[PDB]
Amino acid sequence: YSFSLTTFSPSGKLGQIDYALTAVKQGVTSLGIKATNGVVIATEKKSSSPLAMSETLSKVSLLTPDIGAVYSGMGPDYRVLVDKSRKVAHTSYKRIYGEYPPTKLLVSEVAKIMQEATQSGGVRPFGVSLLIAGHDEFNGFSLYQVDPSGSYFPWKATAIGKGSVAAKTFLEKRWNDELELEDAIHIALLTLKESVEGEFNGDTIELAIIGDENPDLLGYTGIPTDKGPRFRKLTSQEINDRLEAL
Amino acid sequence: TTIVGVKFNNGVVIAADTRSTQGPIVADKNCAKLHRISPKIWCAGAGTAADTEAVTQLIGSNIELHSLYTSREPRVVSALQMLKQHLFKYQGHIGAYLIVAGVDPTGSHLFSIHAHGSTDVGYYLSLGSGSLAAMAVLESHWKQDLTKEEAIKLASDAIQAGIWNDLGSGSNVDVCVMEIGKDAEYLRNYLTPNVREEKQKSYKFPRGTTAVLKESIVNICDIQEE
Amino acid sequence: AGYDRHITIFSPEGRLYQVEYAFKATNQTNINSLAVRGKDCTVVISQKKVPDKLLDPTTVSYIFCISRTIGMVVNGPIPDARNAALRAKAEAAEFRYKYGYDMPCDVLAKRMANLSQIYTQRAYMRPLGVILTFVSVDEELGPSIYKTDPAGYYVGYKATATGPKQQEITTNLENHFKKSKIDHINEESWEKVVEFAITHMIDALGTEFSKNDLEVGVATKDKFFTLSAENIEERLVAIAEQ
Amino acid sequence: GYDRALSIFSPDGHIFQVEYALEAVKRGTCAVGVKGKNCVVLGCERRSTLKLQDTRITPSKVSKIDSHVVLSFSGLNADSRILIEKARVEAQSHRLTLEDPVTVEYLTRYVAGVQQRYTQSGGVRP
Amino acid sequence: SDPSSINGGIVVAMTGKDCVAIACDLRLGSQSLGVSNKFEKIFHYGHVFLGITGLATDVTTLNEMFRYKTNLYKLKEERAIEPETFTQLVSSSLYERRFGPYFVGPVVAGINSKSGKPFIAGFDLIGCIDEAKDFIVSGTASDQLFGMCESLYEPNLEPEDLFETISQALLNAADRDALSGWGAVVYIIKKDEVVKRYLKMRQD
Amino acid sequence: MDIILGIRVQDSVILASSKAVTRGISVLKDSDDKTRQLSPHTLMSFAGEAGDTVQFAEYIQANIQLYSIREDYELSPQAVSSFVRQELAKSIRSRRPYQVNVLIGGYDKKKNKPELYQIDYLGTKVELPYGAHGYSGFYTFSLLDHHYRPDMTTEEGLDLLKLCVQELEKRMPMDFKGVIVKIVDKDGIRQVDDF
Amino acid sequence: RYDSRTTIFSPEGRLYQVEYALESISHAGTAIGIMASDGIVLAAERKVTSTLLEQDTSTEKLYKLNDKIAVAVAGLTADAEILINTARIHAQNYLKTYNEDIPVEILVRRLSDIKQGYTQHGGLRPFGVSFIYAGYDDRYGYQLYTSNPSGNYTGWKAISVGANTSAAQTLLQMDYKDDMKVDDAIELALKTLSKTTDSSALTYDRLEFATIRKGANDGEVYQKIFKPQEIKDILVKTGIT
Amino acid sequence: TSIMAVTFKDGVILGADSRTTTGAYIANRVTDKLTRVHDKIWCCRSGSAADTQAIADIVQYHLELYTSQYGTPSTETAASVFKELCYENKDNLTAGIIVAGYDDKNKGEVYTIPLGGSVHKLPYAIAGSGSTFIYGYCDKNFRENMSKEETVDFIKHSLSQAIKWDGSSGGVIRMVVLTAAGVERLIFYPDEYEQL
Amino acid sequence: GTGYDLSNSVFSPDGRNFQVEYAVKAVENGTTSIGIKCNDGVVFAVEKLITSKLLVPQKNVKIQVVDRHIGCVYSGLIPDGRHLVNRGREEAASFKKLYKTPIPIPAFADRLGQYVQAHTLYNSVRPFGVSTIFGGVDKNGAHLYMLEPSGSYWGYKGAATGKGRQSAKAELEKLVDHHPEGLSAREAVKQAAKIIYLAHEDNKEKDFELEISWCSLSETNGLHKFVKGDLLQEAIDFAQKEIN
């Protein structure tokens, strides 16, 4: 029943999908909050030893300059799948469309890599549920959750991982229909400090935004006609700033 | 077309004209001959416009993919080697001539690459139709070690001689200055040698000066219930 | 109950029992490795345990030269040690001619790690039981240590240790870095950074070492060499003498 | 018995997968054939599931494969549907080769042929 | 004749102020035989118009091919493709078969519903972006058109003055083009609506 | 083959096909068709190089027939023409190119309107009331404008078609030795005997 | 026992895996088509919801496969996703080859083979998707079908798939009218959806709607997906809100 | 474009003309033809410039693997990779390559690899198009087991005659000295060596 | 225990692959193979049991040659060891074509260890179950390895495997004690024989035949060859003299 990708259950569904979901819940807590001019995405880092460099873990990886991600679930699965995601994005949708793809479209490709890893029995699907946030000039700022069940959902605010259930009511309570990015950045840290305490500090919590265009990150100038990276990773020093004013 | 590169101490400049000719007729008066491989690598195209355009795009996506993968700054050095490989595979059945230059942490580099897969390094290069006309200007007027100032002046001078003696090189000069650890400066239409001459009559007339037979609306959108 | 007789089939906790029994196969040669960062070098010192006298000791090793600037230290078993070493070498070669420059410590460790994930992704191969730690001084990152695990998890480090008595090594290192308040050793030639790694390992294990019982690989700036037993010996009386 | 798999034979010499395949035929609608001397009549039960079922566009249980051979079925309706289409590509192809329309004797072999093939193999059900 | 343009045909695209036009002749030829008087060069997908010049078999084949490519996009994103984006789509279809290649010279025309800004483009055989917004011409009368257009071109004519300017350019050129001479259809394109107006002109 | 014509009138479509089959310097047979039905109301004539003609006609015949059975409903002439164009335009980029050129006439029974579609070898669908390939189109296109009207009866279309055969005969070295004249109407496809 | 792979039958000539695949369907929300000679309404219900699930920016249980045929989805949305792409690709292939927008029958028959094919061949999983195909073709006019995950099809005058199939079917056939109106067809879908679904109030945000009509301007075929606000207003009219 | 490599007692010194011509147009005048494939193993390139570069990079992929797994390659070992590649790619490529290197136990070894690809151990070799002008002076003026000064002077002078008698030869005369002291670059400029 | 055999890629909880350990047990039932490395050579000797006294004597070898300079002897199943040497001849031959030199002994060690490792890594093959002692002479002098069915190898001054590894490792352990210097290859021929003679008291039910081979830099021109004739008889006399 539960226990092949091939076998359907009496009430249906594959069990491997359910067990892969279990994996996510053993993960770390990542959460996203949509503001009216951004999306803030936040997660923490752990590594066991403190002798570990924390700036070497990849968990906030830009897929494109327009679209950042986090995960909860398996660490190994992330790096591989981020790698694959990027590769597909240029083949199907940057050699054709001529620019880095839509937030909606790219979320569908990611789901399609998962889906292929469910169809082929003896091959497990990815351990991760990602949050993929981005911007496009048609559908605006957007936020998604793409599950290891190969389905994706759009969301207003969401959290995934172990601490998800505690975070979601904070999100219900504290979300309002009109927010700024700066009130979202503070709400993001506040909620994430529920997930852990005794170790939360600006050098071990990794937090980024997909906000407004920044020509500061564009790296070539004197071309006004294109936009710069929507994405911005905030440094360790910024994360400490926001944690003091909170 | 004409393309030059001038190596200087604190970076490298790549200049190329805006006109594109496909036969004896001018395809475009203004259209870019500075294609973007990566934010710190730029290159200009010569030869058949289609082959250069396609190649730059193909290699460009791979070097942006590489930057993310190696989690460090895009090398000029990566780019050339990968590009060279790409060129080899067709066996010279692709007609791309390029000057690629950039700044990376290994420093500034200025390369020439041919359709065959012959590869060269100098401290001053050119390729294209009007390469012989610019080459003369570089060898004489260049010396080893330059400031920003002298490099930009010498680059626009070479294209400018290009326009005046080369048929396929025309119109304006677009210059891109890549200094080591600084933003590329894309200075669109830095130099004009000859501005436009206007036409001497107005050619706009009333309607019915051109005959109509039928007038129709063609669809482009979906109707409602009205 | 199903769920380490298969590579891919999950447990009802969302763990892969079989993959984790590979994190537990790294004790099979029962050696310890330490690699630490100096300020112009990366040092790795791992045991060389030559058990028998029928063996010639100079072919016993775990430190492999991968490339001009890249070494790798293996903890865990020999058969998989060699498979790890050829793939990293093979990839080192591929990167240089394809992309026309040397291979950094990150680029190699990420690629092997992704490769481990692929081997766990299919049910047509197994994971290996070996822990890989890459050592180098990188072209623009300087001293770098990247540990690639059997699942394909990687994290960088100031210092890492591996093996059965790894926990005993880990407290000694933690206390050093805590007290110093730097992420480096400030000794300014590699001959004393090597001495420092020997020093901490004697205290942790409680054992003396001798010429045959250590292996030392040294990543120096822009070059790499693994030290003979008589050069290790010079280091060992340097410790004893103060 | 030896229904765990198709390729393994059976002490009893009956491949179970075929026997159960027959059993499945009894699910579907009755079809009857009766020959005359100048006619064949091919009739079938067309069982109506609900009164919301169209007669506008809903498939008949009888399908012409070519313009003078007729075919009814009994069985798994899902399975019949590709069996009828496969029968048909060959059938038409019969004219490509010979410039003769489809002979009924060549056609039965072919339909038995796609089926025999599926049974012989192990990585398909009959 | 030449192997990439035995069957002729001409397309001309101009820019006006917040308007485009595109126009073509309707003669199909096959060597020296004029075959059909009605046979359009220009086709459209949503609010972007495309003429495709060249060897006549490939005009028809890419008409179908592009419709397949556009419509896959439209349904999936739930929104129209834009004539900025659509440029790079032609460029990849043409380059896929560099060896044994399509023999066409397509010319886009169109106006964005997110800038309100005219966009025209040209492509060769294996495709290129020719991103001038001067005016873009292709066809067998390519040579003829580049001059006729240039002479008349004043930038930023009003739409109804622009209809005078492109119809006139096209008509003179056509009489003196061997492989086109019959009929004309002129598209005057605006944001709001698209008016199609066939000319009345001479046949040869 | 050595003569191929098409003229479309008020309620029918008229197609003419060469009898002669010229192979080297000998005419091996002087009374063979060069047309095959696609459907009971869609008729395709063919001409071009020998050997290409025969296998192509039969292959297309198999496909249109197979669709007709599948949907249990016959495809409209408009559909049919685009199918035949697609095969030619693919072949011109394939290993073995055809030189089969076709005219496909059909009495469209959904638009209740006669339609003639000329299709050349390279692969060009054009809707046209006239049609012909080879050096037969190079005589009879000129002729057709004057003597045609906006419409006429099928009888007057028959006589009009006979006039183009007479023009060809006089001025073209190629022998065809009479023509098969087939009409495509709303009630089937028939043969009319004509000199 | 026989609850394994697909080659094997049960000695009762049952393939357990097609039977279970049916049962997959009623663990995703109700989906209803009702055919009328004035048009077809397709109406669907969300499987679950929360107060910060965004569902006003996109549909994800109503997909256009082409410009005259569209589908409602009930079942696993992952299984659905691949089959919708394959359907849509084929829909345009038909367009390229014949210059006609694909007939409803050819499209259902294609997908019935494909579903069947994943059960019959290899080791691949069967699909557990029910698509209500609602189309127009100029042969049969207006057409409704639905396809089983089993890989066969039947034409309908009304059908319900998804959760609560039996009840939702019963209320539909109870008040069905042979000629109907498009407007009444929309009303009968809300009336049924209320009693079958265990959500307390029936909200616009728990509904997706699309209508396919040729009677909203003739000469042309108009696919009208209702936006949230149109859905929100029509609940008022029927007095549920 | 004339290239050489000439053995002596303490080693082998490679010589090369830094002129690269595509037709009458000098494509570049300061592009040297000395390519490292290993520490003690270096290669000279003449013939078709594109073709030779492509062969050259693949020999190093092999020799990267060679160093890592199998201990250092010998001068002989690398020259075999060249021979193998040139031979299988007979009709796609003509590469005139001189491979030379220093071993400790064997001193300098020179192998010319023809256009067609073979291998030919020689105490001195010359290849290319610029090499058919200096043969008679190479034979007469050479002696075995030279001293280092003398060997440079032999290479400088032979290559100086090449420039008088070919146009594809020029630039500056490059040398790479391979000895146990290391790898050493040497250069002269035309102002000096036409007074010879 | 039970479980985690029946597969050859399945990890045990202890951290092992059971079936791979059962390989070594098959190698133990195989006949005794030793190698004694010497200061300018290597000597390989093997105990070839006599099935019945109808066997042709000195016409069946478990010694096989690889290229023209590398000796191999396997213990374990006789045909498995054959199959693994054939693959080895093709690999040594590809190396030889490619580089125009004979293999290094470290080179071969790497390559063989990858082919044994490949069959422990996959689910559709049974891992090998042979050890194979091999070595020869190169530029860098003499070298000796013993490759276990686990795919493990190291150099050895001296190596033994088979039923007689209990006796043989002990005799070799005396050999290093009496000679740390190296021992000439000639005197090791006479030594090779005594070692086998005492290792044949673990397979005492049957009779044996002694075959010695060698490869020596200065007394065989770097080449492997069978030791026969007078050299082979002297070793017999040596072993016979001291056993009684």
- Domain ranges in chain H? 1-196
Is-contact B30 B24, C-beta < 8 A? Answer: no
Given an 8 Å threshold on Cβ–Cβ distance, is I100 in contact with H71?
no
User: Which are the contacts of B208, defined by CB distance < 8 A and separation ≥ 6?
Assistant: none
Buried b (16+ CB within 10 A) or exposed e, B68-105: bbbebebbbbbbbbbbbbbbbebeeebebbbbbbbbbe
Given an 8 Å threshold on Cβ–Cβ distance, is E89 in contact with A96?
yes
In Å, the largest CA–CA distance within chain F is 48
Residue C14 main-chain phi, psi, to 5 deg:
80, 30
Where does residue I105 fall: left (phi above 0), alpha (psi -120 to 50 degrees), or beta otherwise? Answer: alpha
Q: The dihedral of CA I198, I203, I206, I208: what is its sign? A: negative
Least Cα separation, residue E17 to chain F (angstroms): 36
For residue I24, the surrounding DSSP H or E stretch is helix I18-29
Kindly list the residues from chain A whose CB atom is less than 8 angstroms away from the CB atom of residue B104.
none
Distance CA B119, CA B101 (A): 13
Kindly list the residues from chain C whose CB atom is less than 8 angstroms away from the CB atom of residue H69.
86, 89
Indicate the Cα dihedral angle F155, F157, F162, F165, nearest 10°: -160
Distance CA F98, CA F121 (A): 7
Is-contact H101 H40, C-beta < 8 A? Answer: yes
Chain F contacts in chain G segment 60-119 (CB below 8 A): 96-100, 103, 105-106
Neighbours of chain I (3+ CB pairs under 8 A): C, H
What are the structure tokens assigned to F58, written together? 């039969």
Is-contact A189 A42, C-beta < 8 A? Answer: yes
Given an 8 Å threshold on Cβ–Cβ distance, is B184 in contact with A218?
no
User: Which are the contacts of D19, defined by CB distance < 8 A and separation ≥ 6?
Assistant: G11
Tell me, rounded to whole angstroms, the distance of Cα B144 from its chain centroid.
25
- Say what the resolution is, in angstroms: 4.9
Tell me, rounded to whole angstroms, the distance of Cα H12 from its chain centroid.
10
Distance CA B119, CA B111 (A): 8
**CATH code for I1-244?**
3.60.20.10
Locate the chain C residue with the closest alpha carbon to I150: C79
Is-contact E93 E65, C-beta < 8 A? Answer: yes
Would an 8 Å CB–CB cutoff place G217 in contact with chain F? no
CA atoms within 13 A on the CB side of C84: 32
Domain positions in chain E:
1-204
Kindly list the residues from chain F whose CB atom is less than 8 angstroms away from the CB atom of residue D95.
58, 61-62, 65
Given an 8 Å threshold on Cβ–Cβ distance, is A98 in contact with E76?
no
The 3-class secondary structure across E43-64, one letter per residue, is EEECCEEEEEEECHHHHHHHHH
Q: Shortest CB distance from B105 goes to which of C97, C99, C140?
A: C140
| Locus of tokens 């164009």 | F85
What are the structure tokens assigned to E121, written together? 């483009």
Given an 8 Å threshold on Cβ–Cβ distance, is A76 in contact with C117?
yes
Nearest Cα to Cα of residue G56 among G240, G188, G230: G230
* Single-letter amino acid code for the residue at H59: V
**Way it was determined:** cryo-EM
CA distances from H147 to E16, F18, H15, H103 (A): 80, 93, 16, 17
Q: Shortest CB distance from G95 goes to which of E68, E76, E78?
A: E68
Instruction: Please report how the helices E159-175 and E142-152 are oriented relative to each other, as an axis angle in degrees rounded to 10.
Output: 140
Distance CA B214, CA G168 (A): 55
Locate the chain A residue with the closest alpha carbon to G53: A155
User: G and B: touch, per 3+ CB pairs < 8 A?
Assistant: yes
In B29-168, alpha helices (H):
49-70, 76-90, 131-141, 148-165
The strands making up H173-179's β-sheet, listed across from edge to edge, are H124-128, H2-8, H11-17, H173-179, H182-187
Write down how long chain D is.
126
Would an 8 Å CB–CB cutoff place B123 in contact with chain H? yes
Given an 8 Å threshold on Cβ–Cβ distance, is G95 in contact with E75?
no
Tell me, rounded to whole angstroms, the distance of Cα F173 from its chain centroid.
21
Strand duo A220-221 + B184-191: pairing? parallel
- Classify I95 as helix, strand or coil: helix
Kindly list the residues from chain E whose CB atom is less than 8 angstroms away from the CB atom of residue B206.
164
Give the residue numbers of I annotated as catalytic, written as ranges: 31
CA distances from E119 to A211, B30, B34, E130 (A): 29, 14, 21, 11
Given an 8 Å threshold on Cβ–Cβ distance, is E28 in contact with F122?
no
- Classify G97 as helix, strand or coil: helix
**CATH code for E1-204?**
3.60.20.10
User: A and F: touch, per 3+ CB pairs < 8 A?
Assistant: no
Locate the chain B residue with the closest alpha carbon to G223: B222
Nearest Cα to Cα of residue I117 among G189, C82, E79, B75: C82
Question: Residue A77 burial by CB count (10 A; 0-12/13-18/19+): exposed, middle or buried?
Answer: buried
Would an 8 Å CB–CB cutoff place I102 in contact with chain H? no
Given an 8 Å threshold on Cβ–Cβ distance, is G143 in contact with D57?
yes
> Which of E70, E74, E77 to probe the A interface (max A CBs under 10 A)?
E77
Distance CA H40, CA H37 (A): 8
Distance CA A37, CA A34 (A): 8
Distance CA G10, CA G1 (A): 9
Specify the fold of H1-196.
Answer: Glutamine Phosphoribosylpyrophosphate, subunit 1, domain 1 (3.60.20)
Distance CA A50, CA C175 (A): 11
Distance CA B52, CA B59 (A): 11
Given an 8 Å threshold on Cβ–Cβ distance, is D57 in contact with G145?
yes
Distance CA A103, CA A137 (A): 10
Distance CA C212, CA C230 (A): 9
Kindly list the residues from chain H whose CB atom is less than 8 angstroms away from the CB atom of residue C223.
none
